[PDB]
Amino acid sequence: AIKKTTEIDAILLNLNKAIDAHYQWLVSMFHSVVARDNDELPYVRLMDSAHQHMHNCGRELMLAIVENHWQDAHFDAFQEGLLSFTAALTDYKIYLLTIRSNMDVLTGLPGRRVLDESFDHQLRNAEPLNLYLMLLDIDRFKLVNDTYGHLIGDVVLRTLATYLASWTRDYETVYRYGGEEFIIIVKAANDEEACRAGVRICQLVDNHAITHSEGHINITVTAGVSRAFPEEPLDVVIGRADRAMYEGKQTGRNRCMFIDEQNVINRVL
Amino acid sequence: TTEIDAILLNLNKAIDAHYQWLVSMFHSVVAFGRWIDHLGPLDNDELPYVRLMDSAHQHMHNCGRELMLAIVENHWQDAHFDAFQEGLLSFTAALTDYKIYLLTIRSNMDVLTGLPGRRVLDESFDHQLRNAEPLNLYLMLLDIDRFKLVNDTYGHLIGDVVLRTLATYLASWTRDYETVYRYGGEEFIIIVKAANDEEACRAGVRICQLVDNHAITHSEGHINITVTAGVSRAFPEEPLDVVIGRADRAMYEGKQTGRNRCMFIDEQNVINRV
Ligand SMILES: Nc1nc2c(ncn2[C@@H]2O[C@@H]3COP(=O)(O)O[C@H]4[C@@H](O)[C@H](n5cnc6c(=O)[nH]c(N)nc65)O[C@@H]4COP(=O)(O)O[C@H]3[C@H]2O)c(=O)[nH]1
Ligand SMILES: Nc1nc2c(ncn2[C@@H]2O[C@H](CO[P@@](=O)(S)OP(=O)(O)OP(=O)(O)O)[C@@H](O)[C@H]2O)c(=O)[nH]1
Ligand SMILES: Nc1nc2c(ncn2[C@@H]2O[C@H](CO[P@@](=O)(S)OP(=O)(O)OP(=O)(O)O)[C@@H](O)[C@H]2O)c(=O)[nH]1
Ligand SMILES: [Mg+2]
Ligand SMILES: [Mg+2]
Ligand SMILES: [Zn+2]
Ligand SMILES: [Zn+2]
Incomplete structure (x- = not known):
């Protein structure tokens, strides 16, 4: 996978x-x-x-x-x-x-570097389907570190990683891209299908508290989804997905955003 | 490797x-019989x-x-x-x-980077603190300033070079007994051993200068960077997470106040720039 x-x-x-x-x-x-x-x-x-x-x-x-x-x-x-x-x-x-x-x-998820090296390939082999990149960034995770400590924070990431891995399909890989940042490469027939995958993951994150030695901690994630057009380099796509996510964070958090071919952002329902 | x-x-x-x-x-x-003796007593x-x-x-x-x-x-x-x-x-x-x-x-x-990872530190920290005596141990957290910009500007490859380079520089600028770890993506930790808080801070502040004073070369030119650091004492029998947290608290205020500077958090949990 x-x-x-x-x-x-x-x-x-x-x-x-x-x-x-x-x-x-x-x-x-x-x-x-x-x-x-x-x-x-x-x-x-x-x-x-x-x-x-x-x-x-x-x-x-x-x-x-x-x-x-x-x-x-x-x-x-x-x-x-x-x-x-x-x-x-x-x-x-x-x-x-x-x-x-x-x-x-x-986390035990693949790192950015894996993606970097494999992306160009994954895009080529996406046909006839469309490829989408989904960026997820934990909401106010600093608070969680500040509140419970870093060990606890480390658990959340491990758990969230594990959950996301279980919630995703085999052919769609979840990567630890950054500290609190995850990427899922989705393959779908249209933008609406991509967004569904996106929005549902965000719910799941919201709907599943993370257990620890000392109790339970709830979290949520703000995501940004985008299309990957043929022959684009990764950095272009991520950037767009980041643009998508940022506005989501501006507007309230715990939500999946999407950036269209026109480079206009809209929240998914 | x-x-x-x-x-x-x-x-x-x-x-x-x-x-x-x-x-x-x-x-x-x-x-194999010949190669085994040709490993050089490990x-x-x-x-x-x-x-x-x-x-x-x-x-x-x-x-x-x-x-x-x-x-x-x-x-x-x-x-x-x-x-x-x-x-x-x-x-x-x-x-x-x-x-x-x-x-x-x-x-x-x-x-x-080729530096040791967080996990190495996690496993060795309790030991390093015990053997610090008679000297005091300090943890120095460094976090590259506006590194996202650098990625956004030049791309990730370039960003990857900067980290490699910075890693290499930091390894060269530090003492043997004081280990540099890649703790996080843009985050480094140096375990300093010194006689007093002032000595630690000097080590801290000087590294930050060096980072500032040495541009990172790449195929397409030169990129300047700086780091905001947070230094803290490691009191006997404390667990790592407590110390880091304190060192993070130190660093954050540094970033609030302007960047490219070394901060220090005292026994009273009060932060002061060096
Ligand atoms: N200004 C300043 N720079 C510092 C200090 N500590 C380390 N550096 C810099 O970091 C380098 C690495 O030191 P090392 O790996 O311990 O390797 C060192 C170390 O093993 C030994 N050495 C140098 N100075 C001292 C010292 O004051 N005490 C001890 N015990 N050994 C020293 O010589 C080796 C080569 O040192 P260098 O080629 O000079 O290279 C030094 C130097 O450029 C410091 O307190 N002040
Ligand atoms: N314990 C632990 N903490 C981490 C790790 N990777 C990153 N962090 C910390 O997570 C924090 C994330 O900072 P942000 O403020 S950017 O995260 P937020 O969720 O608060 O940002 P947004 O509010 O979503 O914009 C930083 O202070 C990092 O040091 C990690 O691997 N283990
Ligand atoms: N090329 C590359 N980029 C990385 C790596 N690890 C982390 N990064 C990126 O470093 C960026 C740093 O983002 P921050 O905003 S948290 O870092 P800043 O320096 O801008 O934050 P501070 O202002 O210093 O708090 C993030 O976007 C990460 O994706 C890496 O290994 N290689
Ligand atoms: Mg966040
Ligand atoms: Mg930084
Ligand atoms: Zn056989
Ligand atoms: Zn044999």
Whole structure:
């Protein structure tokens, strides 16, 4: 999808699980003889292809050994495919780690940098649908820090992060963009659909208090939604979404704003 | 960071190397050891992980030798393969443990700046306060002034450079024993150790000057910045959040009053500019 750091460790685990599993596999062959999204799609396709081929050599190798017409070529071919497999994983591994070295420690959401690097791609692959960026900024969060302390503030962010991650779809990623600032990349058919997604999240934030050791704390967020037109750079879009959000804060808070193609702002209902 | 990727590489190099090894044994029948000592005695944190896998590696090969000998001399048993596999998985466990440890320890280093992250400080603060004696400990919070403007003006890439640079400068301008942390997006913390509040404030105010007195170069020209800081004492047995909060209180008023200045909050919780 991805979001949430935990999701990545889960994979890397299963990658290392394959390494061990395929060691065992090789031992067995040796035993038996004696006894008589579009970003990460390429990496999986690659290793899937490698995996197949590896086993193919193993089968070919085994059959050749048994039927008494094996040749040094058969082992070298198997080893070629086996290292090709362990390459394919490694590539995938790295990619993940890199992408997810930029993962926010506090919340476990992806950081601005992840978005920066992936945005140009996400916009291109949005078609036929439209892409929208939703900026959320916690309302008077300083107060919350001033009132309860920073630890508590840290919890709110963790929680809010977790909630937002749960409330969003898989293909739509939630990013910790800033200190109190979040971005959700929404994909929809029209501006109205985007706004609905926007406005509903704001309600949910409002409608779900954040529990802590010492009790309960209610919050709300003012959001700014905007269209992402083809070939625009991220900074242009954010800026527009920021323009949207600011007016929302001017007008009362706890609300989702939207900035149209004409660069005119209107609150959503 | 770079130092770690170098290792992780060499760990994965062993996995491949030891696949080949196994293939050779299988081939021959049908017919790392050097790198470990070349790590250069590390510290007491990571010693156990290397000892562990070194031990595992040995044992693994031992089974392989025992296995091979048994196969050739015609007195091998299913036990021999299972024993070898036990040791082989024990080896791949030993690496994995080491791997994790590294990643974890090294996730908490800030990717962008290369300074330690908040989490490092969180975990080490209680310790740093205890070992401050006989000296006093102070926390210095720095927050770039109108950095949003800089992003809005030049873009985020440029903004990213400024932070990298500022980080680097601050690291150079601080003492070894006093650590600079990327606490937040535009927020830095320096843990100062001094004899009195005046000494701390001097350290504080001078850093702010340096930031002011050193423009940040980029591909397309030069960008000047400044920082408003907040310094505070750390009294024994206080938790970090209390101190930071106080240091934040100090900084905020500084921003209210004009910016590009170091503020200090006294034992009486009263703020004064340096
Ligand atoms: N004006 C001023 N600048 C300061 C002060 N403390 C640090 N700096 C600046 O920060 C740099 C880093 O100091 P270091 O990493 O402790 O590395 C230092 C430190 O280990 C040692 N050193 C320099 N001065 C002192 C000192 O007063 N006491 C001790 N114990 N060591 C010192 O020499 C190393 C190299 O120092 P530099 O090349 O000068 O580079 C210094 C200097 O440019 C200060 O109190 N006043
Ligand atoms: N504990 C904690 N505090 C943070 C963090 N990131 C940012 N903050 C603090 O949250 C505060 C947000 O300041 P704003 O005044 S801009 O936030 P508001 O919600 O009050 O702004 P708006 O009223 O919505 O315009 C700042 O003082 C930051 O130091 C964080 O990661 N952990
Ligand atoms: N390029 C880049 N920008 C960042 C980063 N971390 C935080 N920022 C931005 O820094 C900006 C600072 O906004 P503030 O208004 S809170 O900072 P100011 O300096 O304007 O606030 P003060 O006036 O100093 O209180 C925010 O818009 C953040 O998006 C970052 O890692 N890379
Ligand atoms: Mg806010
Ligand atoms: Mg600032
Ligand atoms: Zn398989
Ligand atoms: Zn070996």
